[PDB]
Design a protein around this ligand. Structure first.
Ligand SMILES: C[C@@H]1CC(=O)N(C2CCCC2)N=C1c1ccc(NC(=O)N2Cc3ccncc3C2)cc1
Ligand SMILES: C[C@@H]1CC(=O)N(C2CCCC2)N=C1c1ccc(NC(=O)N2Cc3ccncc3C2)cc1
Lengths: 466, 467
């Protein structure tokens, strides 16, 4: 990895575009306002450690970058002198200070989450060089936020239909490993989901958390044995019952998820599970349920008909809230077409038919880790303050045709209001101490990570009210 | 990187779930059939083969790491230590796998086999689908390359209609997406997939990926020009936007320069600052070094049309041989905000209706180009179609009652040219009947070696538009 090749091409040319005698560029990140009213701040620490800390400039990296940019631009615009300065003066350590809200913090939209400034007048151009790398924070922030919003919905419906939150942290399982754009994305995205839940099949998340954040527990996330279409269909069309019986017998003492829609989900539930193999299901421990997995059709319609089928073949109870409950040896996971909108629709549909959310868990792949953009929470990095000819100026954009893109002015700080909410003070007004101490902390200075959070603290910070 | 930790958790348990006496699992990848994305660019497998699958991918340390993680992950000892130890000892940690694939850059209709995966050793029947997760991430470069090519088709159509040629087509959609993707690794893969169709990128990560994994005759596969951002304009102070413009175009007087002009008022910047105050520094510029005015806010179509209307009244407009209005060659526009395949179509159609040549405009796309894409867009999917159990081959498939679109293909698969020059996938080993040409799938990976590679130059050639 070469940080001199880890920026948008045009930023290579920006050192020639700032006002002459500019000693400071000060920039901030926010999830711009215009529903996702609050964001989980998560993922910066990964970027600080993997990409920004320590000796990130070498003589070889300056030469590689010079040679690429000469061909890329068909011209010699690369700031060799500026980068050589970093190498010689700071032994290739970035003269940058980053202040950030603690990771796991749940902050309303339109608040400063981190700030970036150069610590050496010569490196005024460096603040926005690292915009591109830092702005990729959008992704863990957005996954963590969207996952937490889904947990709020599950919390509401579980509490309404059951009268408690038991199993909440296992209700949304990460299926997204194959559905993300890369290995690196898999690790970051799966880690962001595990801020809110403990169930993942995206193994890449575990090593990232252990290396960059750390947990008391040996692993931050768990799974159980489960079938896929290959392990059912390989038995032949006429032997689906043989595949089911072999799989539940192999995993007789742990929870086992069995995809049941290879040929006919409704036949599999009513005839195979419900009659042919019923004796191998009703004998299973409460600690080792069969989890039937439909994987096709209208997600709500399929879940309701699956539960109606199972309710007639298996002994259903009515819980303290008046909602129907399968026996403890039998559960359902809907793992197809699940996103925040269809999750809401399924649990509301279940509640209307008097089915407890105790009966169901969700698996989400593309919905959870991939079908997300930087536009969803308007994650944005902008310059708010420069010093030119020794005088500080408050700078901003305010496009006539889009007031939602107006950026904040001057030196920024995050404060508690008297009512215990958050406010971002602009124009250095934090210095007036009318709102107490700045809640941002120095997390990075002059190539060192100066403040860090365990995954355990991040989880605690990201908890729901209830 | 540890390939034993690079699968879906449940695949760790699948070796205990196959029919006993299964010697072979054969699986295939397709962009399943179901506006309408009828043909896909096959691109990206070679990256995955080299970075993740080739050579000694199993060590004693990787087996122990995986065993220790899975014991905690499952709270149970389901990990296939014996199967992985077998690969270490028998093949020096090289995967006993054969992958056959259509050549990269190939444009194939939906619902066709693009690659096949099978174990080459009976003991490693479980290995074929272990590597489903890693291989299925091919969806991303395939989908970026395909969506980029579909945008090139739209640009081609409107450029040809309004100008009478395709000059500059391969520079008309610029990659702005580096900050808008989920990771550094995604940035490189995505930017490389776009460069199959275009030559303009700001996503520098793509260049190194292509150089390392594909290679080009040309020193670099992609190019850029100096361009401002809001920081380099707004840093001058709100009352000095003209000073920022003049300093920037003077600094880059001899190359194309893109200048974001919407910091305060795009319409004021175009009419008063570019159009009157700084007009003398614009009309003197070379054809090789235009000013490129960049709007970055408002309704993308409405803003582009009003920007062109403003510039057409401050600058000498010609009418080309097709009857379409053309800015002077020293002045172009790039719309780099809210651009995706749908808004690109809407802008060029809107421009054509107002008699503006597509010669006047270029597009920058970030999230639209590299991030706002899913595995479900082309139904990119990996399924087992053939197993050998107790020495007899069985044609296998899924066929869910409530969704016929998820029916998978049966048996040993091959890809053929039809007599009419289209593609067909033959099922059930019917390729072995020599009734069609040769199989278009070639061995690209066998027993830990990459056996066939394509340069980026061949991939580009394969991905060309017909015309
Ligand atoms: C939700 C159910 C309840 C539960 O409390 N757990 C917890 C027990 C402790 C570990 C997680 N796990 C459960 C569970 C159910 C199904 C699965 N896996 C599953 O159905 N598949 C994994 C996967 C990955 C990628 N594509 C499809 C699938 C299907 C995993 C965990
Ligand atoms: C469209 C115009 C026409 C053209 O032929 N070229 C080619 C000249 C040969 C190299 C590329 N480039 C063009 C061009 C215009 C703007 C830029 N860059 C640009 O506006 N920005 C880079 C960037 C990156 C991320 N967010 C915003 C921007 C703004 C790059 C190239």
């Amino acid at each position: 990895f070469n940080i001199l090749l880890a920026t948008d091409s045009y930023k290579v040319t920006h050192y020639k575009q700032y006002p002459p005698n500019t000693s400071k560029v000060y920039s901030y990140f926010e999830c711009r306002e215009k529903k996702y009213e609050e964001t989980v701040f998560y993922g910066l620490q990964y970027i600080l450690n993997k990409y920004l800390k320590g000796k990130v400039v070498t003589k070889e990296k300056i030469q590689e970058a010079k040679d690429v940019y000469k061909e890329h631009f068909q011209d010699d615009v690369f700031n060799e002198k500026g980068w050589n300065y970093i190498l010689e003066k700071y032994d290739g350590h970035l003269p940058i200070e980053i202040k950030a809200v603690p990771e796991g913090f749940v902050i309303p939209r339109g608040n400063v989450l981190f700030t970036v400034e150069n610590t050496d007048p010569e490196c005024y151009w460096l603040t926005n060089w690292i915009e591109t790398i830092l702005v990729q924070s959008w992704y863990p922030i957005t996954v963590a936020t969207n996952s937490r919003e889904q947990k709020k919905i599950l919390a509401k419906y579980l509490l309404e239909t059951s009268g408690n939150l038991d199993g909440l942290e296992y209700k949304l399982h990460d299926f997204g490993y194959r559905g993300v754009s890369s290995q690196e994305t898999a690790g970051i995205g799966a880690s962001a989901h595990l801020v809110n839940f403990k169930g993942t099949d995206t193994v890449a998340g575990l090593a990232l958390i252990k290396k960059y954040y750390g947990t008391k527990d040996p692993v931050p996330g768990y799974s159980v044995p489960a079938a896929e279409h290959s392990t059912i269909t390989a038995w032949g069309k006429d032997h689906e019952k043989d595949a089911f019986e072999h799989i539940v017998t192999q995993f007789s003492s742990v929870p086992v998820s069995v995809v049941s829609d290879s040929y006919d989900i409704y036949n599999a539930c009513e005839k195979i599970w419900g009659e042919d193999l019923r004796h191998l299901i009703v004998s299973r421990s409460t600690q080792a349920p069969l989890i039937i997995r439909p994987d096709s059709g209208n997600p709500l319609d399929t879940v309701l008909k699956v539960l109606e089928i199972l309710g007639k073949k298996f002994p259903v109870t009515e819980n303290s809230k008046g909602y129907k409950l399968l026996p403890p040896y039998l559960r359902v996971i809907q793992g197809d077409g699940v996103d925040i909108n269809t999750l809401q629709e399924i649990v509301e549909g279940m509640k209307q038919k008097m089915w407890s959310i105790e009966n169901i868990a969700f698996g989400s792949g593309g919905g959870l880790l991939q079908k997300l953009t930087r536009d969803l929470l308007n994650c944005s990095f902008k310059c708010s303050y420069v010093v030119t000819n020794g005088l500080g100026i408050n700078v901003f954009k305010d496009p006539v045709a889009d007031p939602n893109k107006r950026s904040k002015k001057g030196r920024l700080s995050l404060h508690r209001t008297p009512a215990g909410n958050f406010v971002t003070l602009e124009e250095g007004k934090g210095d007036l101490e009318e709102y107490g101490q700045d809640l941002l902390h120095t997390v990075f200075k002059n190539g060192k990570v100066t403040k860090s959070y365990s995954f355990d603290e991040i989880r605690k910070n990201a908890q729901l009210n209830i």
